[PDB]
Amino acid sequence: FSSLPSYAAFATAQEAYEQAVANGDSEVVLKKLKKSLNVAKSEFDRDAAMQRKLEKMADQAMTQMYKQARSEDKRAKVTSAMQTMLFTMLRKLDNDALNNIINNARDGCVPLNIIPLTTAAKLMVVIPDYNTYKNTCDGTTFTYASALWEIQQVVDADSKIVQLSEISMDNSPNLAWPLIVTALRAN
Amino acid sequence: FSSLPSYAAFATAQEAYEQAVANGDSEVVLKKLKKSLNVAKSEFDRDAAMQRKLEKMADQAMTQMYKQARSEDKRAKVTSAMQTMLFTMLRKLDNDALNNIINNARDGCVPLNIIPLTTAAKLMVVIPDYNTYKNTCDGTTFTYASALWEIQQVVDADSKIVQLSEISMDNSPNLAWPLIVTALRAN
Amino acid sequence: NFNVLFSTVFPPTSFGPLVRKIFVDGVPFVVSTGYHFRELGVVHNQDVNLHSSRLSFKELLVYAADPAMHAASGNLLLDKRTTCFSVAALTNNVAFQTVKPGNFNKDFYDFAVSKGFFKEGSSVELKHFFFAQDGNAAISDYDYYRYNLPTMCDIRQLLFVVEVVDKYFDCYDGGCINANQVIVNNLDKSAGFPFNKWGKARLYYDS
Amino acid sequence: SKMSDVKCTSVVLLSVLQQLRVESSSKLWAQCVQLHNDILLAKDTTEAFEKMVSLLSVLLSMQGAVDINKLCEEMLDN
Amino acid sequence: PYPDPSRILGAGCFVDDIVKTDGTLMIERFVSLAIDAYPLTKHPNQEYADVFHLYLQYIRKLHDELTGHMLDMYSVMLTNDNTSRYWEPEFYEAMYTPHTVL
RNA sequence: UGACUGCUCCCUAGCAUGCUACUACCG
RNA sequence: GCGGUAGUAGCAUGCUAGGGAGCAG
């Protein structure tokens, strides 16, 4: 803002004109002073305006390109995360029972609702009350979905271990009742 | 805005021009004086508004920072504030049962379960000294929470049953004192 | 209309996505390549490739939103709290979510009381509060879908009611637009199921 | 004016109870929620007071929790 | 149109924390709530207008509290330029008069 | 853990247009 | 003598962008 190309000419002309004015010369030198300084300031005006416009344009361009780079980095990391999640969940497919039921299909297509029903290894049961409990998972082994399951653990709504010896009719009102039963496929 | 050099220059120019005009003069002097005056007037008038905008903006910024600091402070004392407020409203309610149970808890006689409302169901409290037993339990009836209850069991810190006739002024200080009375709500 | 009536005979485990096994660089996947609707019958996908090289971004997005892998890599679940069909449990624990009460503005209440408000027998009283809920509330509210029953319609009358409704919806214009003409407000909101583990909608509209 | 006061006090009491990690016990939290929701729907001012006594008994029967005596000496509850 | 007064009062008294229980931090909540509750002043019943008047007085009290409460410990001096419009009925009456000024 | 729409108020930044003003150039 | 042009300042108007909040289905 102080070392512009026209600054040298403008300042030198102003200094010379004002020295001539301080010399107390005639009115012609004053008119020449006025004209020269007017045109000098007029030419300095656009040189002082266009540069300021250009700097702000350049700054906006820099900001936009920086934010584009940040967006690309975020895209790369989300892609890596999704790939990791998929390849991690792949490793639990039990690839022998799944293959055994896939090959029985006449064209390779099977409903999705029967894959956990015939290939899962663990079963979870949520029991509202004792009357429902004694009709579904009474004892230590029960049958569901044409298979045999054996109990492995029982917890309550607070996630604390509960032993089957205290799930009775008398002791029922002393438990956080939304019980969760975990079993394993037998044989 | 009378603390800037622009104001000083404009004031001196104003005084000089006003004095010259009031003295009476020609046209060229007036033209030169106004040409040297108007630039200083514009110089003053620009800053006269720029300073105001700066000052109001600074005031708004300080306001916003005070608000943020106060909110951050306020969201870190919620437990104590809520407890103090709750006990203030509990004072203002002025109920006899609430006052009774609050004083009882303040002296040491707290309950062990939820106070029942039916004509049945068991209530258990702890009586740590003989004076509380003297105040509340007299005879075979129990007065708690502005109600009437009937004692049916007394248990000590050693869990041995103590009959009601045993408790007396000098006959008490040979006992495990944190007694546990279990009563039912009288009709 | 006829499919709605005829679909009530067949077993309920034969409806939904149809999956099969595809290979990506020699590893096997499980993806959905069709659907079996109760109303629209059997629908098969048109662009399915079994053997393929490493997949792109939109294929990852499509395969991460399919319930096939999530259901096939989970445990069996038998839930007796509700009567709706259950598929699988994604974890080893059941989540119980509660609802908290509100916060009391005591200064405003005192100011209102000091001006003759909330007196006995007044016609203005508080009946709007923040109600709290216990652990088993989400499933209890979801269990209200038991009021949805299969319904057959009078087709010869619906085919005329639809014409009258279309006459009602006649003063507008519509069609498809490109991806650069879509207007979205508040891009700082949730994105869905699998996607809420990595960011909001801004992340997926920028990436 | 004696009813809105008890409803506001019940709201504050439930907030205080929730701050003390009470919802880590499903039965107690369910009972507290039921009482709090029943107070706000009351129409007469006797049932609300007995339910208020029952709800306050939950906070009083927790030894460590809070200091009844300090909170009573701060120009607060008598 | 006018709403149920109980809804407006309940919105005034019951909130989520930080959003209220300190009115000075958010005075623009009560301005919107008073905008919603303006047409209650033409109701033949008397408490209905009292709701709107109470909201206006609370807004003025909150502003005075903020200015004094900030001038006291700190030394920042506040001005009341074009702020009194929020506790006079003419700012709210203009939202129900046809001449869509936004 | 926080969905899809619609309307309204407040604050800041930019753009466009208009009004007035101060200098300067040109005829 | 009148107009045009070039900067500069204040004021007003409508959009776009960002943030905070309110109501309704």
Curated annotation (Swiss-Prot), chains A, B:
Gene name as annotated: rep
Function per UniProt: Plays a role in viral RNA synthesis. Forms a hexadecamer with nsp7 (8 subunits of each) that may participate in viral replication by acting as a primase. Alternatively, may synthesize substantially longer products than oligonucleotide primers. Interacts with ribosome signal recognition particle RNA (SRP). Together with NSP9, suppress protein integration into the cell membrane, thereby disrupting host immune defenses.
Subunit-structure text: Interacts with nsp7, nsp13 and nsp12 to form the replication-transcription complex (RTC): nsp12, nsp7, two subunits of nsp8, and up to two subunits of nsp13. Eight copies of nsp7 and eight copies of nsp8 assemble to form a heterohexadecamer dsRNA-encircling ring structure.
LRR repeat positions: 30-57
Name assigned to this protein: Non-structural protein 8
Originating species: Severe acute respiratory syndrome coronavirus 2 (2019-nCoV)
Domain RdRp Nsp8 cofactor: 1-187
UniProt superkingdom: Viruses
Phenotype when changing residue 113 to S: In strain: Omicron/BA.2.75
Subcellular compartments: Host cytoplasm, Host perinuclear region; Host cytoplasm; Host endoplasmic reticulum
Region (Disordered): 1-73
UniProtKB/Swiss-Prot annotation, chain D:
Effect of residue 71 to F: In strain: Theta/P.3 and Zeta/P.2
Quaternary structure (record): Interacts with nsp8 and nsp12 to form the replication-transcription complex (RTC): nsp12, nsp7, two subunits of nsp8, and up to two subunits of nsp13. Eight copies of nsp7 and eight copies of nsp8 assemble to form a heterohexadecamer dsRNA-encircling ring structure.
RdRp Nsp7 cofactor domain boundaries: 1-78
Function: Plays a role in viral RNA synthesis. Forms a hexadecamer with nsp8 (8 subunits of each) that may participate in viral replication by acting as a primase. Alternatively, may synthesize substantially longer products than oligonucleotide primers.
Compartments where located: Host cytoplasm, Host perinuclear region; Host cytoplasm; Host endoplasmic reticulum
Protein name: Non-structural protein 7
Organism this protein belongs to: Severe acute respiratory syndrome coronavirus 2 (2019-nCoV)
